Amino acid sequence: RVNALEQVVIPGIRAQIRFIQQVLEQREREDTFRLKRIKGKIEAREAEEEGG
Amino acid sequence: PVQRKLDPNTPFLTGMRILDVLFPVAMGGTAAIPGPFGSGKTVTQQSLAKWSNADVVVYVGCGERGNEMTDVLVEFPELTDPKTGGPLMHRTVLIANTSNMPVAAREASIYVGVTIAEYFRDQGFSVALMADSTSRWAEALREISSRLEEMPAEEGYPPYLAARLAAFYERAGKVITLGGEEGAVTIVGAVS
Amino acid sequence: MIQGVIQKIAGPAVIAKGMLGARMYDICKVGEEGLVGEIIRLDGDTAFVQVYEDTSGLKVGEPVVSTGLPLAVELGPGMLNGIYDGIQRPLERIREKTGIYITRGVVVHALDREKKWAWTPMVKPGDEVRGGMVLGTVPEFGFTHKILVPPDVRGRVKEVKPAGEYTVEEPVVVLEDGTELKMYHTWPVRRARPVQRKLDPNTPFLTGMRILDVLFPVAMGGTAAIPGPFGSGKTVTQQSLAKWSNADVVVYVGCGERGNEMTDVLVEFPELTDPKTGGPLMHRTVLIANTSNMPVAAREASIYVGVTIAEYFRDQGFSVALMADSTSRWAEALREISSRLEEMPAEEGYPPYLAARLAAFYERAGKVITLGGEEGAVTIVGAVSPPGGDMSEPVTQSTLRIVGAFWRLDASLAFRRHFPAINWNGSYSLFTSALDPWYRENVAEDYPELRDAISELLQREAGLQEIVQLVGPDALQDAERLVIEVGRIIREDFLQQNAYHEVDAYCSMKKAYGIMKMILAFYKEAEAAIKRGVSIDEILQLPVLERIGRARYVSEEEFPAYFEEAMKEIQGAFKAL
Amino acid sequence: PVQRKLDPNTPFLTGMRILDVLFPVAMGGTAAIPGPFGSGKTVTQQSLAKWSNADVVVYVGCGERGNEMTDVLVEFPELTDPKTGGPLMHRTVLIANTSNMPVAAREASIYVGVTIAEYFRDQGFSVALMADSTSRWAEALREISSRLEEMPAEEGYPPYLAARLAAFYERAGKVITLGGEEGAVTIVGAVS
Amino acid sequence: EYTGITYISGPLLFVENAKDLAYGAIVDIKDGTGRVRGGQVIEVSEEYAVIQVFEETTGLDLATTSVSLVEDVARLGVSKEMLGRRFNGIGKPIDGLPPITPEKRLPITGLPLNPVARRKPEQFIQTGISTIDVMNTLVRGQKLPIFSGSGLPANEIAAQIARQATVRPDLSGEGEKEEPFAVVFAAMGITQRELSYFIQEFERTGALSRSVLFLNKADDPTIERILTPRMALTVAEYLAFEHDYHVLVILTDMTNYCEALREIGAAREEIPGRRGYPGYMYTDLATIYERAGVVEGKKGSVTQIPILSMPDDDRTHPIPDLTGYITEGQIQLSRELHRKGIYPPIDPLPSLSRLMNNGVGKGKTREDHKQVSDQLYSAYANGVDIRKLVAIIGEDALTENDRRYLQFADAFERFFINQGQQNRSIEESLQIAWALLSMLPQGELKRISKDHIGKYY
Amino acid sequence: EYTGITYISGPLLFVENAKDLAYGAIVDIKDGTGRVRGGQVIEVSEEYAVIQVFEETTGLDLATTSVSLVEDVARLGVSKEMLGRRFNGIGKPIDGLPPITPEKRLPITGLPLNPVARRKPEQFIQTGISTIDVMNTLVRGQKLPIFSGSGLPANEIAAQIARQATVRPDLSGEGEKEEPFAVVFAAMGITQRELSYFIQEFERTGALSRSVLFLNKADDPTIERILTPRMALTVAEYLAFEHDYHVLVILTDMTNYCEALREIGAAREEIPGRRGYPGYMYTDLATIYERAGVVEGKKGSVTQIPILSMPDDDRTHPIPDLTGYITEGQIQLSRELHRKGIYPPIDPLPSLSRLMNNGVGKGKTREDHKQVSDQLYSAYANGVDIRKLVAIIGEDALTENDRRYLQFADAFERFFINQGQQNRSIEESLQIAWALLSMLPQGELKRISKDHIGKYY
Amino acid sequence: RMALTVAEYLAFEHDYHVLVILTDMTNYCEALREIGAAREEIPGRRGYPGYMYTDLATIYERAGVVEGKKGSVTQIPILSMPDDDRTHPIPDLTGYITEGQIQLSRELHRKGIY
């Protein structure tokens, strides 16, 4: 258990979180860039009432 | 309308040894039993089917998919009525909404079907309301965004959070009324 | 034609306005010098161009010329030793004339007009031709390049100019119907070549890797992946697949590759003997490779050029092995082009339009009978690149979205330098239900069983390997360690093949069946030998292991040296000693 | 601007054994103290400016604690320097910010302190800066940048986080100024 | 004509001077390739409109962009005989023959069934694996999604079920061969080898006859991967319900579905509400899946069996998601027994059957395997699970009683789940099964009744 | 020329119209606060062209502004006295002494390299840190990234090999007029520690007589970090190929490259997040690692020797991951041996040396160089392997065919890996390597056979 | 905010001593998000807002003693987490301005040790 723990176990179950975290977080890049662009549509549409 | 929110203190029973025993449910209550992505959470309505102590059953589903309410849906008129003897539909009302029924009807569903629970509960009844898998309501609520050119609340969460959920739940459940009758809505949320 | 100008410049892409008569997919030269891009999005009168080459130094306001005729490329002669690439320039020519430095920008003909070849006429005047036929052959090296009639076109023949070497330009067959058919002939890449009947893959492909084929098969028209985590084994496992082939044509697309990534690869081919000649391997190989420094859209375009060339050859009755290096190339093109052209994103910055070409490119893979009157196979064997190191990403699951064969190559195997790195824990094959006929037709009927009987070896090693890591080899008995140190020789001398001995980089069935039967014996004998209480310790010290172990330093002309010899010594002097 | 880059060679003493004797970082080094501030971590920070060979002390916050951020101020003059022989507050410049100060307080924080340190540097005086709550600085930056086109895009924080964090350390060291006087601009990095 | 383009790029178009059209309209487009390309007007817009072109555009000059309304409602004809003839997604035979002959033109979206008109399934069939006809006990009108990750075949192994399928008429008290058992198949996207492999496994039994195949390939329109299912299912309703046939629908390759779904999801106005697929996803998986269920006034049925190729062993991916809730009966295939070479390689650990005393195991479905199934669940659970729990606590901590549990895993899987072209009746199942339960004492036999017990002793 | 600006911003901004602005053109902007800037004109529009702001947003006004084109593209001088001199900084180099005359003014964008104008390696680099150049075989035909990792210094190691590369006529393959003592260093961004470290290192190595080190000086604006790489490069490409010399670009940490690069990607709204660091990364890097090959028809090369650290002692971060993929294989150092005292610590346990028998041979270096390549690797490997399985089953598991491989890891340890900073010839390394190959019985070795056994003891 | 502004006037200006006990922070933070999402402020990590910080400060920073004024408000906020895991904003944020933490044991609460 000592051998295992200090090799595969401890750092491995550590490093898993990281991978998880960073990819779910990274998904929310696409969220913002789209969300931006969604807003751009709402402001543009009202600027085709106030600039065209 | 009602006179005030009261504290429950009289249990409700499904006639089981785990949903009443180790962890009790209340009359005037609220509860939930999440079972991820289906896990035998629809079967707890074969336990509310003819073993409950609800004087008046009011079964509602947001927009449950037909196949899961094919055997459950026609199971009940066949079943014995503990409050009579014939069909279970002497006490059940059954105001269920399905995927077969409109896709917008699913969005309305909860905040409309609350009032049908309330008309009997007011009179002097201890109505048992169950919203069968509230996640079906979330799929309708979050679709609004898509069709309206708005994004939902970030990270796959619905835009309306508390606003249109909590209010239905706490709308009725052990509340003394204006007539001075006792209105108590018992829910066992069959969520995911 | 069409004379607009530029409006905006947007990265390697360029937009233009005043384009009337613009069609989706043409030659779209932007500016006076022209660069040759491609029309994707057409919104209004503004046909969004997406240039293959650099927009560096371009100043806005230079006339834009678009042909308005579908994107076509020259198919006919010159395939052998000609670069056509993705920017539509021969690197060959550039290399000498403008130096070892490429001047970015300016287009030159994809297929040089400086080439000249013999013509052997095979038809005569006053006939009625139909699409897909051959009009004449061209002997170019020790291979026979044919001139194929455009499919789905009919007309009579007016003339056919007699045999002799001429410039490719010269019209060799004038049709009565009014088509002066030049040796090169255009064909689009949006209009693809048809097939008379679709057929099932059934002829095997032999690439020169033992274990690879023997555990998880590949037919001609098959497909498999080559993952390579952290730029590992992958990069040169592909070199050894192309070094020797059983596929007649060799199509290597190394689009978007860099310096050292193609150094040895190419430069070694002029040193390999050719099967149909004996000089440079270039007499059967065609370079569609591109450089990394050229824009995103140049690596997109290269892949579509490959497959239409492959089809051309398939109709000539010639079997094509096509090997696109790394999907990290493909990914990166569409992954960036999405941002540019204001295309909205799907999953991981890749567009929802990713499988556009992809899907259709995998479909073409397969043994079929053409309309051409010949039968070939277009074999595709794409090398995947995991972005995340998981195949859950769409750029990686396309060889596991639709089923066929799939191979698993590991970093950990690559480190001791086991070539290939095939593992039997994430590889399956569907050409194990359709090579069974051709095996027992030519190969052997004692093969559909023997191959399997090797796989069970490493099946049973797995179950145990697990327990090796839970408790050592001193908790496990004689019979446990049995199939473990079978397993050992199946990998030590059967998953490692030397990349500096070229008679292990090519194998044959003779090399196959031989060394499969050696092990058969050992097992079947060893189950009784060790049952007499001879502990595995002693059998490790015997000379018997060492002699069978020479199998990655041996030749094929040194193949009858171990075939018959050691056969008797295995079943013989191991059951007494 | 400067006449030459220099390198520290002024001996390190902070008044703590292992602290400076095993790990020398010298004057014009750049340190850090990780983990959360408080719960025994205050020991180092306090004692540092009392003993340590610097002529001037600069203290600076940017999202500090409540009661703990005041314990320090109040005990500040009762911390005693031996050169000055009484109140430490004499050769200490305060510019500290807590979250009971405006939005943009914490975002403006750094640059201020950085500049003033260079003043002292110029007069041949070594300063002793303490850039506490680095982690928390960015809170503000993020908030401001939401409302803009400079949205978070890294890993939940600005990508311009990277520029102004870096540069903060690249302006601080031992160097020889234009007037030819040498000071030192040592940072202790409580990130939290 | 409506000239002045706004967007041109593959199957999705926009063209102006369009503000008065209907929902679903077959228009034409005169192309610059000279190939006349269709297109249904799925939505209408302010001063332009969305056309969703049936073929993929590869050249179309903006100077002459012709549009010509053929019909105001996109529909599809019908017939009563198409049996035995193959077709593609467009509606054209693969034999090169003429299409069906309209009788009436029905919408392609179709119209769903009332939940009240559905009545409990109970008429069980032989699928030719004892494993399904016991544990889940597949019945008419029911769905069995075959959960299968990537790197595990399911098109291949599905053909096995597809040829072993045969009604049960002597156990249900009445004929079921008296009303046609036609079958439907339909791919959303497949290769070259799997094309011929399918027909050659239908030609091997002559189960090819009386089938309607609405295949899709990967080189056939990418827009019609998701259009053609919806079409085909409303040609099912006609022969299944209104001609009273028992129609088996098998829809296989449900990722390639999702490929075509993706395209609209995000590129257009629609947003990706989970994993690049639209947020109208719910509908996109409702009209497809809802078709099936036994009628109370017809004696025909649509039994649909979706076969997935869902990504890896993930359960948060859209496919495993919604499919969970929907079905009651479901089965999983895994890769663990698939490399042993056993076919089918069932792994039923996350698998569930919520009907097995109610619904199936009553009526026309026999009840001698009622309590049997329920036994078999936990009996198999105790086996394979504890192989793990021993190698965790120590490596040996079983008694001799628990030895039996794992003694019965190894046996059961090999024999029971393995059939190639072997077929065993429900009774031939039971017999055998209860003789392998004899490797177990009481406590792994309580649930089984006094009747069943002795019956198969 | 364009007067007026309609956006004051820090990374990019509005410049009305365009009619002569090239892509990647040099513009000069007087901010009206007495300051002046430049930049590249990457993206040119007749609406709003946006120009590369070279410094922060402060110190800008609309009271006085002008935009004025200076040159078509980027350009800069390359002296033939560039070698033997350090030219710190960029544009006007401040190496603290006068700038050298821009003798040949040519572009600094990059000049591409034809893939058919390349030839297989034939040069070796004899560097004084034995361990690497023996096993990994440091040749110019590989460009392996050296990964330092956290709490492992990037500077010390890079510092080392600076003076410690030496040249022979034929122990290095090629001649000593084909390899000068000149080298080139190109910074991907230097930091506090990285600069305060190389200060002392210039006066000791000979950055005035054998080394060129272009820097960013650690305090110049962010955009400078996407300028110095390719600028540093092109310079050397000239004297290397055209003048004939071998030079090695010794990079520095690509972390600060990402850093600067990313801010452009969120101010243009590109793909700046692959897993928290750019998805567009590789596109710009095509040029850096394109010239890192070996030219054909000219002599002398350019080879990128990436040296980059990792933000965590795990590779879950894009930093080393995307680099792995781009380039070929890896060489590492880790912290296995660093915790105990060994210096230089070198662990090539998960390493991959792509080439190791090309660019060397027999007689190009030594006879036994080609053979002792793979040998050490697996001899040593299987040393550390034992210490794994001993502890799993009690505290031993070792045999007598273990006691020899065991001590082959001690013998390789402090005798070979540890060396100080002491120059070691390819002779002194391989010679004595064979007396450490006398700890396992010779004659029949894993990769060596009897052909160097009786020659080298 | 209501009783906040009244509180100032209770404990500092009457010399009284108040104890503010808030409960359920999850709701406080959900509702907040909806408001900010329409002012063009992007939500934060694990969906919970990033403009939280400022607003959460203003409730808690009317705590701490005051020179010469003996009476001051003691702050005790109570918030919920799935298992007291620190993998979302709700604790992080809080945990910088506030001092200490006092988490709840499953063992204890089972046995009825309160």
PDB file of N, CA and C in Angstrom, chain E residues 336-377:
ATOM      1  N   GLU E 336     -15.546  -5.600 -22.202  1.00  0.00           N
ATOM      2  CA  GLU E 336     -14.903  -6.458 -21.306  1.00  0.00           C
ATOM      3  C   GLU E 336     -14.999  -7.947 -21.700  1.00  0.00           C
ATOM      4  N   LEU E 337     -16.248  -8.386 -22.241  1.00  0.00           N
ATOM      5  CA  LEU E 337     -16.458  -9.777 -22.577  1.00  0.00           C
ATOM      6  C   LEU E 337     -16.322  -9.880 -24.096  1.00  0.00           C
ATOM      7  N   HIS E 338     -16.237  -8.721 -24.714  1.00  0.00           N
ATOM      8  CA  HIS E 338     -16.250  -8.615 -26.194  1.00  0.00           C
ATOM      9  C   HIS E 338     -14.881  -8.980 -26.709  1.00  0.00           C
ATOM     10  N   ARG E 339     -13.773  -8.733 -25.845  1.00  0.00           N
ATOM     11  CA  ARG E 339     -12.458  -9.222 -26.208  1.00  0.00           C
ATOM     12  C   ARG E 339     -12.203 -10.696 -25.839  1.00  0.00           C
ATOM     13  N   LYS E 340     -13.069 -11.314 -25.032  1.00  0.00           N
ATOM     14  CA  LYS E 340     -13.060 -12.775 -24.810  1.00  0.00           C
ATOM     15  C   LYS E 340     -13.538 -13.418 -26.094  1.00  0.00           C
ATOM     16  N   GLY E 341     -14.458 -12.729 -26.830  1.00  0.00           N
ATOM     17  CA  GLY E 341     -15.000 -13.200 -28.095  1.00  0.00           C
ATOM     18  C   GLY E 341     -16.387 -13.770 -27.930  1.00  0.00           C
ATOM     19  N   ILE E 342     -17.063 -13.522 -26.765  1.00  0.00           N
ATOM     20  CA  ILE E 342     -18.396 -14.038 -26.490  1.00  0.00           C
ATOM     21  C   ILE E 342     -19.222 -13.048 -27.219  1.00  0.00           C
ATOM     22  N   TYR E 343     -20.342 -13.476 -27.859  1.00  0.00           N
ATOM     23  CA  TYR E 343     -21.359 -12.628 -28.589  1.00  0.00           C
ATOM     24  C   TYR E 343     -22.825 -13.035 -28.139  1.00  0.00           C
ATOM     25  N   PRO E 344     -23.692 -12.122 -27.701  1.00  0.00           N
ATOM     26  CA  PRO E 344     -23.476 -10.652 -27.485  1.00  0.00           C
ATOM     27  C   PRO E 344     -22.646 -10.508 -26.160  1.00  0.00           C
ATOM     28  N   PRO E 345     -21.951  -9.443 -25.865  1.00  0.00           N
ATOM     29  CA  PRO E 345     -21.172  -9.458 -24.617  1.00  0.00           C
ATOM     30  C   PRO E 345     -21.913  -8.626 -23.507  1.00  0.00           C
ATOM     31  N   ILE E 346     -23.096  -9.080 -22.981  1.00  0.00           N
ATOM     32  CA  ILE E 346     -23.899  -8.308 -22.099  1.00  0.00           C
ATOM     33  C   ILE E 346     -23.057  -8.035 -20.868  1.00  0.00           C
ATOM     34  N   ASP E 347     -23.208  -6.784 -20.346  1.00  0.00           N
ATOM     35  CA  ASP E 347     -22.780  -6.377 -19.066  1.00  0.00           C
ATOM     36  C   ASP E 347     -24.025  -5.701 -18.566  1.00  0.00           C
ATOM     37  N   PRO E 348     -24.731  -6.208 -17.547  1.00  0.00           N
ATOM     38  CA  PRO E 348     -25.938  -5.569 -17.051  1.00  0.00           C
ATOM     39  C   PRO E 348     -25.871  -4.860 -15.690  1.00  0.00           C
ATOM     40  N   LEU E 349     -24.699  -4.408 -15.239  1.00  0.00           N
ATOM     41  CA  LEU E 349     -24.474  -3.644 -14.010  1.00  0.00           C
ATOM     42  C   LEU E 349     -25.194  -2.240 -13.933  1.00  0.00           C
ATOM     43  N   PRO E 350     -25.087  -1.328 -14.866  1.00  0.00           N
ATOM     44  CA  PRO E 350     -25.889  -0.159 -14.779  1.00  0.00           C
ATOM     45  C   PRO E 350     -27.263  -0.329 -15.450  1.00  0.00           C
ATOM     46  N   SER E 351     -27.475  -1.429 -16.240  1.00  0.00           N
ATOM     47  CA  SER E 351     -28.680  -1.752 -16.909  1.00  0.00           C
ATOM     48  C   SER E 351     -29.850  -1.963 -15.953  1.00  0.00           C
ATOM     49  N   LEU E 352     -31.083  -1.635 -16.376  1.00  0.00           N
ATOM     50  CA  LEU E 352     -32.241  -1.702 -15.484  1.00  0.00           C
ATOM     51  C   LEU E 352     -33.396  -2.190 -16.266  1.00  0.00           C
ATOM     52  N   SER E 353     -34.321  -2.825 -15.542  1.00  0.00           N
ATOM     53  CA  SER E 353     -35.535  -3.285 -16.126  1.00  0.00           C
ATOM     54  C   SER E 353     -36.436  -2.918 -14.957  1.00  0.00           C
ATOM     55  N   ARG E 354     -37.474  -2.090 -15.210  1.00  0.00           N
ATOM     56  CA  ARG E 354     -38.400  -1.482 -14.322  1.00  0.00           C
ATOM     57  C   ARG E 354     -39.761  -2.134 -14.544  1.00  0.00           C
ATOM     58  N   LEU E 355     -39.855  -2.984 -15.610  1.00  0.00           N
ATOM     59  CA  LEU E 355     -40.965  -3.812 -15.921  1.00  0.00           C
ATOM     60  C   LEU E 355     -40.541  -5.248 -15.943  1.00  0.00           C
ATOM     61  N   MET E 356     -41.021  -6.044 -15.001  1.00  0.00           N
ATOM     62  CA  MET E 356     -40.650  -7.422 -14.981  1.00  0.00           C
ATOM     63  C   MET E 356     -41.547  -8.263 -14.141  1.00  0.00           C
ATOM     64  N   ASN E 357     -42.561  -7.579 -13.524  1.00  0.00           N
ATOM     65  CA  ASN E 357     -43.633  -8.212 -12.747  1.00  0.00           C
ATOM     66  C   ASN E 357     -44.810  -7.484 -13.126  1.00  0.00           C
ATOM     67  N   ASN E 358     -44.620  -6.198 -13.549  1.00  0.00           N
ATOM     68  CA  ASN E 358     -45.699  -5.369 -14.086  1.00  0.00           C
ATOM     69  C   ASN E 358     -45.319  -5.244 -15.473  1.00  0.00           C
ATOM     70  N   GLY E 359     -46.236  -5.394 -16.426  1.00  0.00           N
ATOM     71  CA  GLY E 359     -45.967  -5.168 -17.844  1.00  0.00           C
ATOM     72  C   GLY E 359     -45.507  -6.398 -18.519  1.00  0.00           C
ATOM     73  N   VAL E 360     -44.271  -6.848 -18.352  1.00  0.00           N
ATOM     74  CA  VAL E 360     -43.792  -8.096 -18.845  1.00  0.00           C
ATOM     75  C   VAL E 360     -43.850  -8.987 -17.648  1.00  0.00           C
ATOM     76  N   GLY E 361     -43.885 -10.302 -17.801  1.00  0.00           N
ATOM     77  CA  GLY E 361     -44.072 -11.232 -16.750  1.00  0.00           C
ATOM     78  C   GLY E 361     -45.514 -11.189 -16.213  1.00  0.00           C
ATOM     79  N   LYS E 362     -46.442 -10.930 -17.142  1.00  0.00           N
ATOM     80  CA  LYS E 362     -47.882 -11.007 -16.859  1.00  0.00           C
ATOM     81  C   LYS E 362     -48.574 -11.178 -18.240  1.00  0.00           C
ATOM     82  N   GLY E 363     -49.833 -11.682 -18.187  1.00  0.00           N
ATOM     83  CA  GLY E 363     -50.611 -11.878 -19.309  1.00  0.00           C
ATOM     84  C   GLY E 363     -50.146 -12.888 -20.323  1.00  0.00           C
ATOM     85  N   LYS E 364     -49.819 -12.357 -21.538  1.00  0.00           N
ATOM     86  CA  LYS E 364     -49.314 -13.176 -22.655  1.00  0.00           C
ATOM     87  C   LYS E 364     -47.894 -13.503 -22.468  1.00  0.00           C
ATOM     88  N   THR E 365     -47.220 -12.774 -21.604  1.00  0.00           N
ATOM     89  CA  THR E 365     -45.834 -13.032 -21.233  1.00  0.00           C
ATOM     90  C   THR E 365     -45.989 -13.914 -20.139  1.00  0.00           C
ATOM     91  N   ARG E 366     -45.261 -15.058 -20.065  1.00  0.00           N
ATOM     92  CA  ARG E 366     -45.308 -16.095 -19.074  1.00  0.00           C
ATOM     93  C   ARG E 366     -44.736 -15.573 -17.812  1.00  0.00           C
ATOM     94  N   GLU E 367     -45.190 -16.114 -16.660  1.00  0.00           N
ATOM     95  CA  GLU E 367     -44.899 -15.715 -15.343  1.00  0.00           C
ATOM     96  C   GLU E 367     -44.134 -16.770 -14.641  1.00  0.00           C
ATOM     97  N   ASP E 368     -43.578 -17.825 -15.361  1.00  0.00           N
ATOM     98  CA  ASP E 368     -42.707 -18.835 -14.722  1.00  0.00           C
ATOM     99  C   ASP E 368     -41.293 -18.331 -14.679  1.00  0.00           C
ATOM    100  N   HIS E 369     -41.024 -17.144 -15.333  1.00  0.00           N
ATOM    101  CA  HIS E 369     -39.730 -16.587 -15.277  1.00  0.00           C
ATOM    102  C   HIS E 369     -39.849 -15.290 -14.583  1.00  0.00           C
ATOM    103  N   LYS E 370     -41.031 -15.014 -14.044  1.00  0.00           N
ATOM    104  CA  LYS E 370     -41.320 -13.800 -13.322  1.00  0.00           C
ATOM    105  C   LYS E 370     -40.349 -13.520 -12.180  1.00  0.00           C
ATOM    106  N   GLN E 371     -40.298 -14.491 -11.211  1.00  0.00           N
ATOM    107  CA  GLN E 371     -39.625 -14.357  -9.977  1.00  0.00           C
ATOM    108  C   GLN E 371     -38.200 -14.784 -10.191  1.00  0.00           C
ATOM    109  N   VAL E 372     -38.014 -15.520 -11.334  1.00  0.00           N
ATOM    110  CA  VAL E 372     -36.756 -16.097 -11.881  1.00  0.00           C
ATOM    111  C   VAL E 372     -35.781 -15.054 -12.252  1.00  0.00           C
ATOM    112  N   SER E 373     -36.180 -14.123 -13.134  1.00  0.00           N
ATOM    113  CA  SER E 373     -35.439 -12.908 -13.479  1.00  0.00           C
ATOM    114  C   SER E 373     -34.896 -12.226 -12.287  1.00  0.00           C
ATOM    115  N   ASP E 374     -35.717 -11.856 -11.335  1.00  0.00           N
ATOM    116  CA  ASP E 374     -35.454 -11.079 -10.091  1.00  0.00           C
ATOM    117  C   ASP E 374     -34.383 -11.789  -9.242  1.00  0.00           C
ATOM    118  N   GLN E 375     -34.368 -13.137  -9.311  1.00  0.00           N
ATOM    119  CA  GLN E 375     -33.381 -13.964  -8.676  1.00  0.00           C
ATOM    120  C   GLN E 375     -32.150 -13.764  -9.333  1.00  0.00           C
ATOM    121  N   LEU E 376     -32.128 -14.006 -10.674  1.00  0.00           N
ATOM    122  CA  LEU E 376     -31.013 -13.918 -11.587  1.00  0.00           C
ATOM    123  C   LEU E 376     -30.212 -12.590 -11.550  1.00  0.00           C
ATOM    124  N   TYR E 377     -30.917 -11.476 -11.329  1.00  0.00           N
ATOM    125  CA  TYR E 377     -30.259 -10.215 -11.091  1.00  0.00           C
ATOM    126  C   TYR E 377     -29.218 -10.256  -9.999  1.00  0.00           C
TER     127      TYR E 377
END
